[PDB]
From a paper:
Chaperonins are homo- or hetero-oligomeric complexes that use ATP binding and hydrolysis to facilitate protein folding. The group II chaperonin from Methanoccocus maripaludis, MmCpn is homo-oligomeric, consisting of two 8-membered rings stacked back-to-back. Both share a similar domain arrangement, in that each subunit consists of three domains: an equatorial ATP-binding domain; an apical domain that is involved in substrate binding; and an intermediate domain that enables communication between the equatorial and apical domains. By contrast, group II chaperonins occur in archaea and eukaryotic cytosol and have a built-in lid segment protruding from the apical domain that opens and closes with ATP binding or hydrolysis.
We use the same computational procedure to extract and classify the individual single subunit density in each ring. This operation yielded ten classes of distinct subunit conformations. We observed little backbone variation at the inter-ring interaction interface as the subunit changed from the open nucleotide-unbound state (class 1) to the nucleotide-bound closed state (class 8). Each subunit conformation can occur in the rings of different nucleotide occupancy. This suggests that conformational change in chaperonin MmCpn is relatively independent in individual subunits of the ring.
Numbering used by the authors: 18 to 522
Write the structure that this text describes.
C-alpha cells in the first residue's frame, strides 16, 4: 500500500547484518550459498560484494559504498549504520503529517553546517614532530593486532615513514616493500645504508666477498640479433657442429676482460654467462651477479648516484657508478652484502626475522599496513578524535544551532544529531556494557570547557583521553563519511512511489 515503507525497511535489514561488525572486536556472520564454499570474513565491503539482495531498491544504498571504498577503504561501514538510524526516525515523524520534502530539507542543511564544525574540532599535527608522530605509531600497532612488541616494532616504523617523506611532504605506498626470512627473534630488523635486490644468482662460483668495490649496471641481453627485413634460415652443412662450441665461448673471454679493464669490481646483468668465464672472475676478484628485476635497476642509480647503462657491448671507465656502504654480515650461514637506506630510496626493503613462519606472516602484513594508515596523515596533516569520540561532540553543537531555525523543519535537524549516537552504542553493546549507563558520563566531560579528545576505551572500559591512549584516524574518512551518507540516504527518500514500467531494457 505505502510501498515506501518496504523500501526503507529493506535498508534496515542490510544494516543489522553489518551493525555488530563495527570496531576492532566483532563477531562475523557467514552466508554460505547452496554451492558449499564456506568462507568467513570480518571486513565490511567483502560481505556486500557477495550477498543476494531481495528488492532492487537496496542496490542504490550499496553502490554509494563501493565508490567510497576505492578512495579510502576504511570508514565505509560507518555510513551504513547511520543510514539505518536516520531512516527509522523518519517513521516517527511521518506519522505527524510531515511531508518528505520537509525532512530532506533538514539533512541537506545540517550536513552543510557540519562541514564548518570538524575543521575546528580537528587537531593540527605536523609531518615532522617526533613527539606527536611516535604517539600515532602506537595507535596503529594496537588496532591491527600485535601488542607482543609494540615498543620495538613501533620505533622502527617511525624512522621509516618519516625518512622516506619527500621534500614537499607527500609519500606513496609503492616506495615500501616487505620481505620474509627465518631467524631467532623479531628484534633483528634494522637498517644500514645501501640497496637490496630481490633475486640471487643461480650459481656458486663467482666471488662471495670483496671489501671496497664499485657497482656496475647492465641491462643488455645476449640473444642472437634479428634483422628487420624478413628472412629464412636454411642449413645444408652438417659439418658445422663442433665449431660454435669453442668459437662462441671465446667471444665472452675478451668481453669480460674489458669489464675489468674499465674498473668494475661488481656487476649485475640479466642473461646468463658461460661457466669458463665464471672461473676467471674468482681469480680476478670480481664479485659479479646476474638475474635482476627491471624495477631494481632503477633504484641502484637513484640512491647511490650510479650511472645506469643499457648496452653491454660498450663499457668505458666513465660508466662506473659508486657504492654506498659495504659491510659484512652473516645471514644464517652465507655472508652477502645486504644493506638498505631510507634518506632517498625508491623501493626500500625490510628484512623481517622470526623463529617460525607463523609469526612472520602476521607482522609482515602489519608493516605494510602501518604505512597506509599513517601515509594519509603525512599528506593531509589533519586528524580527529576517532572511535566514536568525534560524534558525541557534534550532538551538542547541532542542538544549539537548531534553535535558530524556526518552523516545522527543526524536528529533522534534531533527529540528525541524535542519529549520530549509534556509533558509540554499537561499540558498547559488543563489550557487554550498558550504553544507557555509560553514555551519560561521556557527555558530562563535554559539558562546558572540557577536553575535546575524550572517549570510551574498549580495552580498559572507562572514560579516558583518545590522543593519550591511541585512537586516531584521518580527516577525509569522517568528513566524507557524513557527506556520503547525506547524499546517499536522500536518494531513498525522494522516491515518490514505485512504478510498473514495462520493458525496462
Amino acid at each position: 500500500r505505502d510501498a515506501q515503507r518496504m523500501n526503507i525497511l529493506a535498508g534496515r535489514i542490510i544494516a543489522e547484518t553489518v551493525r555488530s561488525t563495527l570496531g576492532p572486536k566483532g563477531m562475523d556472520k557467514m552466508l554460505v550459498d547452496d554451492l558449499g564454499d564456506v568462507v568467513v570474513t570480518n571486513d565490511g565491503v567483502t560481505i556486500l560484494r557477495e550477498m543476494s539482495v531481495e528488492h532492487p531498491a537496496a542496490k542504490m544504498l550499496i553502490e554509494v559504498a563501493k565508490t567510497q571504498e576505492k578512495e579510502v577503504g576504511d570508514g565505509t561501514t560507518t555510513a551504513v549504520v547511520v543510514a539505518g538510524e536516520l531512516l527509522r526516525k523518519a517513521e516517527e515523524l511521518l506519522d505527524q503529517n510531515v511531508h518528505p520534502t520537509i525532512v530532506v530539507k533538514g539533512y541537506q542543511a545540517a550536513a552543510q553546517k557540519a562541514q564548518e564544525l570538524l575543521k575546528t574540532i580537528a587537531c593540527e599535527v605536523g609531518a615532522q614532530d617526533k613527539e606527536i608522530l611516535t604517539k600515532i605509531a602506537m595507535t596503529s600497532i594496537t588496532g591491527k593486532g600485535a601488542e607482543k612488541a609494540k615498543e620495538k616494532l613501533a620505533e622502527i616504523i617511525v624512522e621509516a615513514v618519516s625518512a622516506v617523506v619527500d621534500d614537499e611532504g607527500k609519500v606513496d605506498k609503492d616506495l615500501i616493500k616487505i620481505e620474509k626470512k627465518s631467524g631467532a627473534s623479531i628484534d633483528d630488523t634494522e637498517l644500514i645504508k645501501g640497496v637490496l635486490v630481490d633475486k640471487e644468482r643461480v650459481s656458486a662460483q663467482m666471488p662471495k666477498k670483496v671489501t671496497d668495490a664499485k657497482i656496475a649496471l647492465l641491462n643488455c641481453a645476449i640473444e642472437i640479433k634479428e634483422t628487420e627485413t624478413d628472412a629464412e634460415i636454411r642449413i645444408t652443412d652438417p659439418a658445422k657442429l663442433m665449431e660454435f662450441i669453442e668459437q662462441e665461448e671465446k667471444m665472452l673471454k675478451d668481453m669480460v676482460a674489458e669489464i675489468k679493464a674499465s674498473g668494475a669490481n661488481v656487476l649485475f646483468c640479466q642473461k646468463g654467462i658461460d661457466d669458463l668465464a665464471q672461473h676467471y672472475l674468482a681469480k680476478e676478484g670480481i664479485v659479479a651477479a646476474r638475474r635482476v628485476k627491471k624495477s631494481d635497476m632503477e633504484k641502484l642509480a637513484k640512491a647511490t648516484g650510479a650511472n645506469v647503462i643499457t648496452n653491454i657491448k660498450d663499457l668505458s671507465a666513465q660508466d662506473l657508478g659508486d657504492a654506498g656502504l659495504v659491510e659484512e654480515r652473516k645471514i644464517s650461514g652465507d655472508s652477502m652484502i645486504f644493506v638498505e637506506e631510507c634518506k632517498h630510496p625508491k623501493a626500500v626493503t625490510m628484512l623481517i626475522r622470526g623463529t617460525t613462519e607463523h609469526v612472520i606472516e602476521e607482522v609482515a602484513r602489519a608493516v605494510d599496513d602501518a604505512v597506509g594508515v599513517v601515509g594519509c596523515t603525512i599528506e593531509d596533516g589533519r586528524i580527529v578524535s576517532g572511535g566514536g569520540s568525534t560524534e558525541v561532540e557534534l550532538s551538542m553543537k547541532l542542538r544549539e544551532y537548531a534553535e535558530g531555525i524556526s518552523g516545522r523543519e527543526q524536528l529533522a535537524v534534531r533527529a540528525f544529531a541524535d542519529a549520530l549516537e549509534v556509533i558509540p552504542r554499537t561499540l558498547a553493546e559488543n563489550a557487554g556494557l550498558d550504553a544507557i549507563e555509560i553514555l551519560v558520563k561521556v557527555r558530562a566531560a563535554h559539558a562546558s570547557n572540557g577536553n575535546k579528545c575524550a572517549g570510551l576505551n574498549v580495552f580498559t572500559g572507562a572514560v579516558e583521553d583518545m590522543c593519550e591512549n591511541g585512537v586516531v584516524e584521518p580527516l577525509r574518512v569522517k568528513t566524507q563519511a557524513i557527506q556520503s551518507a547525506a547524499e546517499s540516504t536522500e536518494m531513498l527518500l525522494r522516491i515518490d512511489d514505485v512504478i510498473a514500467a514495462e520493458k525496462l531494457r
